Every structure is written in structure tokens, then in C-alpha cells.
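Journal club side-thread
Mid-discussion, someone asked how the predicted structure for our own chain would compare to the paper's figures. Pasting it here so we can look after the session.
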Amino acid sequence: SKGEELFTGVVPILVELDGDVNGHKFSVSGEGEGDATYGKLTLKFICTTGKLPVPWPTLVTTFVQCFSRYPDHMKRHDFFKSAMPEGYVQERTIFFKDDGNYKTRAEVKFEGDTLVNRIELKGIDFKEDGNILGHKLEYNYNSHNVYIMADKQKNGIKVNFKIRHNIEDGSVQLADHYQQNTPIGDGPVLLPDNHYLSTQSALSKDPNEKRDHMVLLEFVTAAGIT
């Protein structure tokens, strides 16, 4: 396809985010690379404004599904790569159960050989003593299924899934994700049949890094269609 070929090898990745959660302003820069052939992502994020005001796990989904591995028989359902190199807009509302919500708007596209994800995040109605602003979430991550449906109305896709973050007391903090993606260019894109992405993520720390940061290793494969 017009974008499939752009992901046959290792692609450098850059992530830039500006956020405001209940008035707490912060920025994050991330770098790494992705190898869609194997659905693999390796990235390191740094809070460039000091200490991150929310827990790192809560931003993982916000921080390039074009790196998902789509089985050859499912290639016609790969909206993400089809929108490249012009890219796509990714918007979400993430509802943290019994707490506030994040609204995000991002643009994912190529700048030369680098795949860039530029994001604006706004969080409101959070409890200053809740699990988010109170930093009560464990630094870990679970495997999830990301459900995708076409949206011919806007020539894009609708995505939904639930992330369950582990709370330090053994409980769980649900983060309900509502997502929409639309192409940036006026070119054609692939509208998919219903399917999902199987995702797994591991979080770690750089032992020599004194800045507030997160190291992420992720594997994602499309499934649901035979």
C-alpha cells in the first residue's frame, strides 16, 4: 500500500506531549523505535518540566497503532498504516472511574524518516486525593484488547477499550477509553471490518536516569478475523 511499505523496517519514533490536568501543567518527550513486522515498540519518555503530576501508567495509551502487527490475511483492515505518510488525527476521552477524565488530541505522521506523535492532553474534574493526582497506582501494566470498528461517516475508525490500572491497595482503577481516528490527508484509507488489537506492555526504569521518566516495551498484534 501507500503506507505499508513505510513500516517494513525499523522506524525511529518521536513523541511530544503538552498536558494540563486540573491546572497542573507538564510536558513529556519520548524517543524510541518501532518494528511493525514484529508489532514491537521500544521507547523512553522524559518529563521535561520536572515531576510528572499524574502516574506514568495513565499516559501509556496516549503515548502509534501504525506499529501494530497486522497478519497478512488482515492487511486490508490496517487503517493506521494506510493513512501514512500524511497521517491521522487521534482523539480520545478517557474516563477514570470515580475520578476525572482526560481529553486528548494527537497527530501521528511522518516528518522525514521519523514517525511523530504530537499530543495535547487536558484533564479535568480529578480528585486531588484520588488515585491519579494522589499517585496511588502501581508502576506496571496489564494486557488488553483494543476493539476497532469502521466509521464511514467520517472516513475513519472508532475504537473502544477498558484499561484497568492496579491500585497500591490491591484494587483496580478503571480507565474507560473512547477513541476516534480520521485521516489528515484527503487521500484514500482502509476502512476495516470489526477486529481488535492484542496488546502487552512492560514498564521499567533507566538506572542512570535522574529525571522523572518511563521506559516502555510493547508488543501488539491485530486479531479477530480468520
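Post-session note: The radius of gyration is 17 Å.
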